[PDB]
Amino acid sequence: MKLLVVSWGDFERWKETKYRFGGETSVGPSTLPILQKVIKPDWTVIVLSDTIGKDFSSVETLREDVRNRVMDFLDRIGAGREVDVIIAPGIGEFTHGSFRGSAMDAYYYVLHALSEIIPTKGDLEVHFDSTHGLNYVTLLTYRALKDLLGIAAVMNTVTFYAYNSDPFVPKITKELNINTIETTMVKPTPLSEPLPGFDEYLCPYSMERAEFVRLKGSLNTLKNLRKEKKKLEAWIGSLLFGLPLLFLEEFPDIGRLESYIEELAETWGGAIAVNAEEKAVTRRLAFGSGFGTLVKLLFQARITRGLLVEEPYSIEKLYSVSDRLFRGSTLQRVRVELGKIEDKAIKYARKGAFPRDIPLRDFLGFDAANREVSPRNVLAHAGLEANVVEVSMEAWEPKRPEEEAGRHTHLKYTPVGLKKVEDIVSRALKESH
Amino acid sequence: MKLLVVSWGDFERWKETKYRFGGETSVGPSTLPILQKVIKPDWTVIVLSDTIGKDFSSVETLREDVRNRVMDFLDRIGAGREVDVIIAPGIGEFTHGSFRGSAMDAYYYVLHALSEIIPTKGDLEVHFDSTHGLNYVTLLTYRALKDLLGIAAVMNTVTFYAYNSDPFVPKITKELNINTIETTMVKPTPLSEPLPGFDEYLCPYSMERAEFVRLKGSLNTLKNLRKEKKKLEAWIGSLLFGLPLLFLEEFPDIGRLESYIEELAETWGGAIAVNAEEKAVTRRLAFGSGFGTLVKLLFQARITRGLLVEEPYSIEKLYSVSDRLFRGSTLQRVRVELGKIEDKAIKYARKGAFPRDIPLRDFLGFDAANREVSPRNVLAHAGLEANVVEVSMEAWEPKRPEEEAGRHTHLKYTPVGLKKVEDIVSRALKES
């Protein structure tokens, strides 16, 4: 899958010129048709400001205005119609109207928008054109694009290209070259944020104290997230710290996450007052970092959902999950920890012993010296700490126990053990931020 | 230490407006004084396109012309004397001149320029303004800033703020708000890319390929990296994978890296052909990714230079280094591995035993026929693998061995061991 994103300003104010790209040449007011010809994308994404709209009779009338205007422009230029248009919440006081709100709303809106567009299965080749864009929309789109591709890179190969044209001077210009200003193999960056406090999901921009308190107080998200917070932070830490069993046991509910993001996005959408007479759009609620963290969390869940399996978790399963999620010394320490339990399972099996629901400490034959559960031992042993994990060997007739022990040996956090791991991994994720 | 960086285009064509920022107000043509007034920066940086240069005699009368007119404009609105001015190489075909070259040369030049300005000690509060910026220069300056602060974040606390004002619209404009577009705690990202092939340090933009090969041949830098490439990638791997002994032993020569960069820099600049009559700059050499990696490598070395402790490398010193350099699970892995060697060294000290110049396998007491050095065992055991490391205990009169053993127990790689580790860590960094 190849993906072309373009940051656009006011497209009706652009001059006809000549564009050079990949040896091909193009006459027109936009870089898009030559970008599509050369790159041949599987899908195109256009990101432009809300401020281009010229109708204030409704918020949806303001977006059907801007959309139709873009649909005309794509016909004027040789551009296709396989396109998604993201109408981002823009700021300022213009000749044809006024738009107030948090400037950071565009980041959270575009992040949320791109989250539902960027494919969650297979490799990504992403092309970003900034020739036509506004400074602050372009930077926040670049940032929102990168942050998601960083989570995509955990499971899949992600190459990122960025283009800007030669600068346009009124009449000195004859041909503009479309230059590659970036070419990057996106590094895998799993989410390393804790869920923030319940002030930083939706904030009041221009709203009376009592009215905001009623909206905030009405949200199912904040009520639910209060109790679900620790487990989601335990899962976030599972990817970051190299804990393959906690990844599986703490895999989040995608439906519930989808529910939280739609609820907040809708409260924000509904809190936009479009004053039809005096041509003013006021976004009376602003998105917080908490909304951003949730969007990223659900994206990481979608990216990695294919690894999840049913409740009996074998050492062979933890091996394969680990080889996908982890790299470098994190991966190799996990393989050594699974290896030590595997090699012990093999010894038991040679003797015709198949222990069931036994603590890992009793499985590996530890001393009675330490039963306390430290962050040191939890983090250092890929979360397979001796005092929290329970082991069960399903019985079989061994002929080559070296290769069949892995499938028949299962690991499980004790109900007490899981809560000790949750506290440690949650606290460590919050202390590392 | 608070830092302020601003992205500027053509600073003359801006009109008088007033600005609102953080419970203050200001009148003038740029946001810099009201930013300085609220932010209270210990230093200011200004990144410009060199395309605004008018007098074309040669390169020093372009970086003069622009620095002249920047310093005139900074007297007009009282920006003070605490300012650094980066005249980044721009491209295009303009009213008063023509600048040709690679679009990406601005990134590497600003990266290089920023690598020498940004403090390499103490916490950082970086403030960034995109109000006045060109499209590409602002985007590359932003990326250049983030790439360096990510490495700075390894050792210090780095908070980053970005600003862009309400859009200046000439009719119906009363006052523009300085909007905060970004506020983030910068995540520690240690350098995680190998040094490339000796192709991609300088590339010919507009140089006949026979001339480039001649020039690439006269560079001492590429001939010196030929040797060092592996030993430097091993050091890069040391930070990324949590290998504290390899970090100390492979610690790069800063004076030497300084001389590589300055040579690649002054070579690039010496291949800029200015033509006074045609009014045309041409940057015949382009900066490659290899130049960027060397600047980032040097910056990471400056950031972590304080940790290069005096020899020999004791368990106590390795703990101290590790406690500063590593986080999360990687730190605990390293602490557990130093704890294994420490606890053994205590058991030895109790019996009155102080082994000297002993392989770590013999120190820990290992079976035969596990002498093959696997990537698995080097990366998984904080690079302290039993077949590559040599332990020494300087004999002492113990009183509390549990406290004393850490100081008196030294670790080093065997001459053969270090090359296998270098090979393993270099290879692991390339598969990335």
Added chain:
DNA sequence: AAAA
């Protein structure tokens, strides 16, 4: 806790 690698060959507690």
Added chain:
DNA sequence: AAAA
């Protein structure tokens, strides 16, 4: 809001 193709160099506020």
